[PDB]
Amino acid sequence: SGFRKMAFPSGKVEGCMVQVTCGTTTLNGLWLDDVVYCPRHVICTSEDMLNPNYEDLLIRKSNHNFLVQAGNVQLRVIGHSMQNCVLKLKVDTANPKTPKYKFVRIQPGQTFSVLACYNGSPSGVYQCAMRPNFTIKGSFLNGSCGSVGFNIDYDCVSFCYMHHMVLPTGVHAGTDLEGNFYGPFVDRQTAQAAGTDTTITVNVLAWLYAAVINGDRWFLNRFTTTLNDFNLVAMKYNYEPLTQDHVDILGPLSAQTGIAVLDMCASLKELLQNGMNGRTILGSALLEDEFTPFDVVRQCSGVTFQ
Amino acid sequence: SGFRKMAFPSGKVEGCMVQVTCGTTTLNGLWLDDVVYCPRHVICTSEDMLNPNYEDLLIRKSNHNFLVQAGNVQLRVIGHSMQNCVLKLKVDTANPKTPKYKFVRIQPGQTFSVLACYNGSPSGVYQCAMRPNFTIKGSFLNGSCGSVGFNIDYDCVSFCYMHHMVLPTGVHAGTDLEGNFYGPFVDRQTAQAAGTDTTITVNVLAWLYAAVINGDRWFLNRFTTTLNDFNLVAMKYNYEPLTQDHVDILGPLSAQTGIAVLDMCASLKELLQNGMNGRTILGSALLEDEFTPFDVVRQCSGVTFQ
Ligand SMILES: *[C@H](O)[C@H](C[C@@H]1CCNC1=O)NC(=O)[C@H](CC(C)C)NC(=O)OCc1ccccc1
Ligand SMILES: *[C@H](O)[C@H](C[C@@H]1CCNC1=O)NC(=O)[C@H](CC(C)C)NC(=O)OCc1ccccc1
């Protein structure tokens, strides 16, 4: 009963959040095994951020210039390296709360949970989606960098995101845990464009399937459509083109509810052309695109983790 | 930058979730010190739930009839009692992961985080509000009972909610940690009415203040109003009557943004009478009422916890 935008239990990630200062800049770090990961602009002064030469800036930095604090105790830095836009601080103490983890470069349209932190302490947890334009719509203030996004599979934490900056439009940009930015973004204080953000069409359809499962069915029509004719409406409304892979991913939900994918596409077509007439679906007046088909199955069947 | 419905870090609560079975019924329990708290209908069979006599049902139950599992190890039950609609199972082992905690009966309009669990294992975490009619709009399936709602103050966990049942309208009902139901609800399988749910007016105003802080200002008008004239619009649109206490709680946000409370009430009045004209505020097409004034200050200033 009910459908909510819920996030993973963040307990396994809270144990990995540390505080990292270099000079006057302080941000968060990810402590896994004997390595601490954090954005590389921790070495930047307020002036350096306009056009930083990270190679020249890092060279004037030694191990003792990095203050890594895990709660009450410090970590002795015994090595540092720069991998893309992230620093890897080698410490002498392995994190005893290190969970089973791996690094994953997420795909556009997929979702993950963000644990927003400040000064190495967690502040909150929320669910976001990697937009098609490789941005996210999160809640990040000054000091939030180094906060990580992740997914949980039973006991395996798949880290996929690390926050770095906000764009002029208010959306946020970051990297994977190997330091590669999602999108055409660079870690420099300059006006960067994210481009036209389209709607994750497969996610909208999966959300409409969750609505029928929960009792909202007023949007179910008596029409059908073709992939090509739907994508003619989709492209006009800045929606992702639907593919046969997208149809196959929506397969299990289509068989469960007995509603063909193309029939659900026709219901979504009328919604784009006629609006919503002041009505709501699952308590929303807009078409939600931050629930993937796997997020619908997980919440509607009660999948748990460690 | 950005405003999201974020939940507290659930790490301190994950360590307290256990599994409780009595007969064939299995639900979640809250393990604090040497006591396990769980809903009392764990002693009910599928037939008993229609009209249970918990006094007569509990009397035929002994300590060994309660299977309390905390992950891989069992807890030896050495005592049981019934406090209102919750059972207090005394165990021989104090939970080593017990955080600083206390029990709080939340007020209508306040918010808290829910950690949805199944079989004693966390499944997800989301933020909800205690509606004026003492219901919540959560995501709860079969097996979710015993899941708890809570707030975190630095290192103190204030447990305030325990899930018990869903209503015919799809909303959920539960108790405090002393077993007293929020609302006129009883733990029995029967059609129970929740009454007219009104909108938390002070929460809507605090959300509009968060919008101005984040850049959404199109709803700011050039009118003003009186508490009485606003409440004339409020009562018509099923909104909570605004009081001087509500104005005082919105004080710090009013002084921060330089917008008088009554002026913000006038902007909210026009929104109720004219709708939204297909526009969005903070990415929503509806007026959000699940952010309290304290939830706005916390997210817009970066308050952290342990
Ligand atoms: C790191 O904590 C911080 C996060 C920002 C601060 C406010 N909201 C956020 O998401 N990121 C930065 O300070 C970043 C540093 C660069 C070296 C990457 N700069 C940044 O986010 O500037 C915002 C901006 C840049 C250019 C045009 C408009 C805005
Ligand atoms: C406990 O896990 C369960 C939670 C329900 C199951 C589906 N969604 C939920 O929130 N609660 C119950 O099973 C509860 C047991 C009573 C003894 C309190 N009964 C219940 O929720 O029944 C739902 C209902 C009752 C009457 C009319 C319409 C629906």
Author numbering:
A (entry chain A), B (entry chain A): 1 to 306
What does the paper behind this entry write?
Paxlovid targets the viral protease nsp5, also known as the main protease (Mpro) or 3-chymotrypsin-like protease (3CLpro).
(B) In E166V-nsp5WA1 (yellow), GC376 adopts a conformation similar to IIa in E166V-nsp5BA.1 (A). However, in all E166V structures reported here, the N terminus changes orientation as Val166 cannot form a hydrogen bond with Ser1′. However, GC376 still inhibits E166V-nsp5WA1 and E166V-nsp5BA.1 with similar IC50 values as the respective WT-nsp5 proteins. NIR-resistant replicons remained susceptible to GC376, which can still covalently bind Cys145 by avoiding a steric clash with Val166 through “wiggling and jiggling.
